[PDB]
């Protein structure tokens, strides 16, 4: 057990191992209560997150367990991973706080890139890395649900990591109005058309790729309905095949109230873009999710010929998420979380 020291940060007392020095509050709070630090064992600048009393309810206790399980599993160059997890408690009986440590992320895609279009070579490399990480995520049967520029960390060498695992689900209010947290969502999850699956994340990648090519948001809707109208103008109104798959009777009735429209010519929307990029966008931005390209298929598309290497695009170890359908009491979720803290093994 390391020696811990105490200091007042973010309105509470933080107690951390001596290896972490120069703690300073960082960020806006979007990912929790976070400080930047220098890790003297590894030489890295790190982010340290404190979960203060996270066993206050069944919902919070299970969410804490979920975040630790997901972060402990993710081991891929293009996905956030866990450097350390610790508690100052010496036993289960005094266990109350959890701290998580990762690499410190400087910039994201949209603080760096807002209002600006990038060169085609840059677009190839950035989208390639998103798809490489997504192939890994999907091979573990995890659905991200919230890919957007603010969740993509990027360094000076254009290297990228996917963020946002195990946090609270987004609220109705967070999704209302002229807001970036809805502009990247697939129509079937935005409007609860049907039981969705991992294909929702490929729609989001298409929206991100379009924005890197043009410098502009693809579907900047002022509300859910305005956004649906922007989507259907580009990709066309649904045919009878997809209408049958919309299990919501009320949503199906609303769709039929709209005049029918054909799919637009993407070469006349994305004027001047690499024809191979136009082709890939047509395969991602398909209304019927069953027919969208997968991450593994997209890595083999000719647009990525200068980066694709099928011997260096790994998949994940199996991820048991049977806990997600299990009902337990607060103290049982707490004991499961403690076991995962004490069993952590750091990376090489």
Ligand X SMILES: Nc1nonc1N1CCCCC1
Indicate which of Mg ion, Cl ion, ligand X, none lies near residue 2 (CB less than 5 to 8 Å, by partner kind).
Answer: Cl ion
Range 221-280, binding ligand X (CB under 6 A)? none
What residues from 78 to 117 belong to the interface with ligand X (CB under 6 A)?
A: 80, 100, 102
247 carries a ligand binding annotation: no
C-beta of 71 vs 208, nearer to ligand X: 71
Annotation-wise, does 300 bind a ligand?
A: no
The answer to whether residue 164 is catalytic is yes
Cα of 90 vs its chain's centroid, Å: 34
Q: Coil, strand or helix: which one is 233?
A: helix
340 binds ligand X (CB under 6 A): no
Please report which helix (H) or strand (E) contains residue 91, including its range. Answer: none
Task: Using CB under 5 A, list all residues that contact Mg ion.
Answer: 146, 164
Q: Which of 150, 74, 54 is nearest to 107 (CA)?
A: 150
List all residues 6 or more positions away from 325 whose beta carbon is below 8 Å from its beta carbon: none
* Selected catalytic residue, list 141, 157, 164, 201: 164
β-bridge mates for residue 276, sequence order: none
Over its C-alpha atoms, the chain yields an Rg (Å, rounded) of 22
Element (H, E) at 123: helix 120-139
Residue keyed to tokens 């199996």:
318
Q: How many angstroms from the chain centroid is the CA of residue 100?
A: 18
Q: How far apart are CA 26 and CA 255, in angstroms?
A: 45
Are 207 and 219 spatial neighbours (Cβ–Cβ below 8 Å)?
yes
160, 153 Cβ separation under 8 angstroms: yes
First-to-last CA distance in the chain?
Answer: 19
Question: Does 54 participate in binding Cl ion (rule CB under 5 A)?
Answer: no
Contact region with ligand X (CB under 6 A), list: 15-23, 109-117, 163-171, 261-269 = 163-171
The backbone torsions φ and ψ at residue 104, rounded to the nearest 5 degrees and listed phi first, read -85, 125
One character per residue 170-199, x = contact with Cl ion (rule: CB under 5 A): ----------x-------------------
Task: Choose the one of Mg ion, ligand X, Cl ion, none that binds residue 180, judging by a C-beta under 5 to 8 angstroms depending on kind.
Answer: Cl ion
Query: Among Cl ion, ligand X, Mg ion, none, what does residue 79 contact (CB within 5–8 Å per kind)?
Result: none
Q: Minimum Å distance from CB 332 to ligand X?
A: 22
Given the rule CB under 5 A, which of 129-137, 144-152, 280-288, 332-340 is the region that contacts Cl ion?
144-152
The answer to whether 26 is annotated as binding is yes
The one of ligand X, Cl ion, Mg ion, none whose footprint includes residue 34, by CB under 5 to 8 A per kind, is ligand X
Residues 6+ apart with CB under 8 A from 178: 220, 221, 222, 223
Residue count (the chain):
348
**Within 10 A of 338 (CB to CB), how many other CB atoms are there?**
17
Span of 113-121, 165-173, 178-186, 262-270 interacting with ligand X by CB under 6 A? 165-173
State whether residue 152 is helix, strand or coil: strand
Please identify, using beta-carbon distances, which residue of 217 and 274 lies nearer to Cl ion: 217
Residue 72 assigned as binding residue: no
C-beta of 151: minimal distance to Mg ion in Å?
Answer: 7
- 30 in a labelled binding site: yes
Count of residues interacting with Cl ion (CB under 5 A)? 15
Complex with Mg ion: residue 108 or 313, whichever CB lies closer = 108
* Binding residue ranges: 26-34, 49
- Residues in the site for Cl ion, rule: CB under 5 A? 2, 17-19, 87, 89, 96-97, 110, 148-150, 180, 319-320
Please identify every residue annotated as catalytic: 164
* Binding residue ranges for ATP: 26-34, 49
């Amino acid at each position: 057990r390391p020696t811990f020291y105490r200091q007042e940060l973010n309105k509470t007392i933080w107690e951390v191992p001596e290896r972490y020095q120069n703690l300073s509050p960082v960020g806006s709070g979007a990912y929790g209560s976070v400080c930047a630090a220098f890790d003297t064992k590894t030489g890295h600048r790190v982010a340290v997150k404190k979960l203060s009393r996270p066993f206050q309810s069944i919902i919070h206790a299970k969410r804490t367990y979920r975040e630790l399980r997901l972060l402990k599993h993710m081991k891929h160059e293009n996905v956030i991973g866990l450097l350390d997890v610790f508690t100052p408690a010496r036993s289960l009986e005094e266990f109350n706080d959890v701290y998580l440590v990762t690499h410190l992320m400087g910039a994201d895609l949209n603080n760096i890139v807002k209002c600006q279009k990038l060169t085609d070579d840059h677009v190839q490399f950035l989208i390639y890395q998103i798809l490489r990480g997504l192939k890994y995520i999907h091979s573990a049967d995890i659905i991200h649900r919230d890919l957007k520029p603010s969740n993509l960390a990027v360094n000076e060498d254009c290297e990228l990591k996917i963020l946002d695992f195990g946090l609270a689900r987004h609220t109705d209010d967070e999704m209302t109005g002229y807001v970036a947290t809805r502009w990247y969502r697939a129509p079937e999850i935005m409007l609860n058309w049907m039981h969705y699956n991992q294909t929702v994340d490929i729609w989001s990648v298409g929206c991100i790729m379009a924005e890197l090519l043009t410098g502009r948001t693809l579907f900047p809707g002022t509300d859910h309905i305005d956004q649906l109208k922007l989507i259907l103008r580009l990709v066309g109104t649904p045919g009878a095949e997809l209408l049958k798959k919309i299990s919501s009777e009320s949503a199906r009735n609303y769709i039929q109230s709209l005049a029918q429209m054909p799919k637009m010519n993407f070469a006349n929307v994305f004027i001047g873009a690499n024809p191979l990029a136009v082709d890939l966008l047509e395969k991602m931005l398909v209304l019927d999710s069953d027919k969208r390209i997968t991450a593994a298929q997209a890595l083999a598309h000719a647009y990525f010929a200068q980066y694709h290497d099928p011997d260096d695009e790994p998949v994940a170890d199996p991820y048991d998420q049977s806990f997600e359908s299990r009902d337990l009491l607060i103290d049982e979720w707490k004991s499961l979380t403690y076991d995962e803290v004490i069993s952590f093994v750091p990376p090489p």
